[PDB]
Structure 1
Amino acid sequence: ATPDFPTHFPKSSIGIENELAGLVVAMPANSAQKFGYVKSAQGDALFMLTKDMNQGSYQRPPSLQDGKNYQNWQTHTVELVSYPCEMDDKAAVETRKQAMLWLATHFTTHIDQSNHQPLAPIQSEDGRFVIEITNAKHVIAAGNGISAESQGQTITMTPSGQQATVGVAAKGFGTSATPELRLLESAPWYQKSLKSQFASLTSAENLDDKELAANVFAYLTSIYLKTAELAKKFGIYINEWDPMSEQITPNANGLTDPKVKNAWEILPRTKPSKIVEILSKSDAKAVMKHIKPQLQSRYSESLSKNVFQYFQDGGEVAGHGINNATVGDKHSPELAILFEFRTVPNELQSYLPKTE
């Protein structure tokens, strides 16, 4: 079994996604995403071997007929998904990058002499890396896996197949205290002006933590307003809001549509309703009460009510979120909020492995 991602980190954390070029993985239909992992010889889990984009049904090349059942098998692109590490842990960042590059060289040899065969659980020649196979019911095939023989491909990685996910303490969003927080606050959907706006709206209120409440308000309001902007732009069905009722033609399959996720640029990966937990019951009520008018002064009553209710009931920004991540003291853990960089910016390029 592939180990689950560690959930706790002392400070800011980073995870990477690396979609490979030059090969496919074929597995039975409805198989688990994870088929293995790469760890250091010391035992530290570095990255998962996963199936990503469905490339169509698998057809075993006739010249490689082996008496085995490949019925209903599907071909997918391979994506190397790192196990998160501390952002300032130079060794852990580099080991992940080096392990990913080694596996690409291993994959290059695999498609040359073992085309249409599963990966074997092996140790690297230098002893640094170990492959663990959790699902042996898979095959690795060159290119798109139609031909029995390869085109002598070198397995590569490129910025277009790359993503990064940054995890920060939820209390820090809006503080601009660290370079990571400043980078996340630069998100085009984040409106820092909403912090001072909340302070102006709550002068007569005796709040437990005024600065924290303003930070949570700005964060949540920015997400709620962007969701309403995207629902209007892309014609998305949110809760009971019908885009067609406002003469909007749908041009996206929902909140999880790649182009909707790309429109965020810095995509929130944590359930918005989780942040309410970092505040007192009183402060959370004060924050939540002030969000509705921000939506209603910019969007229709139906869109405003539907966006507000969706996130209030624990609605996700773009599908299943990473909601169990924590930061700080191991014994008294604080909520961590995650963000996916749809395109890796210049500030995070050093965390990504490069073939060239």
Structure 2
Amino acid sequence: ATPDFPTHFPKSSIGIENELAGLVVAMPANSAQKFGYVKSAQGDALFMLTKDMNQGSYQRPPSLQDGKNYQNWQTHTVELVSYPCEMDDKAAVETRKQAMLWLATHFTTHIDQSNHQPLAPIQSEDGRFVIEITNAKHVIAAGNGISAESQGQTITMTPSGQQATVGVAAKGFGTSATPELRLLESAPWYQKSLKSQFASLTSAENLDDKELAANVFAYLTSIYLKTAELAKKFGIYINEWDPMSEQITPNANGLTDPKVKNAWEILPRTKPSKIVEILSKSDAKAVMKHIKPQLQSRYSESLSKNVFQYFQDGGEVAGHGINNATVGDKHSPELAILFEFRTVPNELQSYLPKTE
């Protein structure tokens, strides 16, 4: 079994996604995404071997008929998904990059002499890396996996197949305290002006933590307003809001549509309603009560009510979120909120492996 991602980190964390070029993985239909992982010889889990983009049904090349059942098997692109590490852990970042580059070299040999065969659980020549196979019911094939023989491809990785996910303590969003926080706050959807706006709206209120409440308000409002902007732009059906009722033609399949996720640039990966937990019951009520008018002053009553309710009931920004991540003291853990960089920016390029 592929180990689950560690959930706790002392400070800011980072994870990477690396979609490979030059090969496919074929597996039975409705197989689990994870088919293996790469760890250090010391035992530290570095990245998962996963199926990503469905490339159509698998057809075993006739010249490689082996008496085995490949019925209903699907081909997919391979994506290497790192186990998160600390952002300032140079060794862990580098080991992940080096392990991903080594596996690409291993994959290059694999498609040359073992095309249309599963990957074997092996140790690297230098002893540094170990492949563990969690699902042997797979095959690795060159290119798009139609031909029995390869075109002599070198397995590569490119910025277009790359993503990064940054996890920070939820209490820090809006403080600009660290370079990671400042990078996350640069998100085009984040409106820092909402912090001082909340302070102006709550002068007569005796809040338990005024600065924290303002930070949570600015974060949540920014997400709610962006969700409403996207629902209007892309014609998305949110809760009970119908875009067609406002003469908007849908041009996206929902919140999880790649182009909707790309429109965020820095995509929130955690359930918005989780942040309410970092505040007192009183402060959370004060924050929540002030959000509705921010939506209603910019958007229709129906869109406003539907966006507000969706996130209030635990609605996700773009599908299943990473909602069990924590930061700080292991014994008294604090909520971590995660963000996916749809394109890896210059500030995070050093966390990504490069073929060239």
TM-score, structure 1 normalization: 1.00
Deviation at 1:173, TM superposition (A): 0.0
Deviation at 1:308, TM superposition (A): 0.0
Q: 1:334 & 1:307 partners in 2: Cα distance?
A: 27
SS of residue in 2 equivalent to 1:16: strand
Summarize deviations over 1:27-62 as a string: whole Å, max 9, x none.
000000000000000000000000000000000000
Deviation at 1:315, TM superposition (A): 0.0
Deviation at 1:66, TM superposition (A): 0.0
SS of residue in 1 equivalent to 2:262: helix
Instruction: Percent identity, please.
Output: 100
Deviation at 1:214, TM superposition (A): 0.0
SS of residue in 2 equivalent to 1:14: strand
Deviation at 1:137, TM superposition (A): 0.0
Summarize deviations over 1:175-217 as a string: whole Å, max 9, x none.
0000000000000000000000000000000000000000000
Q: 2:82 & 2:325 partners in 1: Cα distance?
A: 15
Aligned residues: 356
Q: 1:307 & 1:132 partners in 2: Cα distance?
A: 43
Q: 1:84 & 1:247 partners in 2: Cα distance?
A: 44
Summarize deviations over 1:201-242 as a string: whole Å, max 9, x none.
000000000000000000000000000000000000000000
Q: 1:285 & 1:259 partners in 2: Cα distance?
A: 34
Structure 2 residue aligned with 1:211: 211
Deviation at 1:304, TM superposition (A): 0.0
Summarize deviations over 1:93-123 as a string: whole Å, max 9, x none.
0000000000000000000000000000000
Structure 1 residue aligned with 2:266: 266
Q: 2:161 & 2:172 partners in 1: Cα distance?
A: 30
SS of residue in 1 equivalent to 2:160: strand
Summarize deviations over 1:302-340 as a string: whole Å, max 9, x none.
000000000000000000000000000000000000000
Q: 2:251 & 2:112 partners in 1: Cα distance?
A: 42
Deviation at 1:8, TM superposition (A): 0.0
SS of residue in 2 equivalent to 1:338: strand
**Is 2:149 the counterpart of 1:149?**
yes
Q: Detail structure 1 runs of 4+ shifted over 3 Å in the superposition.
A: none
Q: 2:161 & 2:303 partners in 1: Cα distance?
A: 34
Deviation at 1:74, TM superposition (A): 0.0
Summarize deviations over 1:263-320 as a string: whole Å, max 9, x none.
0000000000000000000000000000000000000000000000000000000000
- Consecutive unaligned residues in structure 2, runs of 5 or more: none
Q: 2:80 & 2:323 partners in 1: Cα distance?
A: 22
Structure 2 residue aligned with 1:250: 250
Q: CA RMSD in A?
A: 0.0
SS of residue in 2 equivalent to 1:163: strand
SS of residue in 2 equivalent to 1:157: coil
Q: 1:285 & 1:54 partners in 2: Cα distance?
A: 44
- Consecutive unaligned residues in structure 1, runs of 5 or more: none
SS of residue in 2 equivalent to 1:60: coil
Q: 2:277 & 2:82 partners in 1: Cα distance?
A: 28
Deviation at 1:345, TM superposition (A): 0.0
Deviation at 1:342, TM superposition (A): 0.0
Structure 1 residue aligned with 2:77: 77
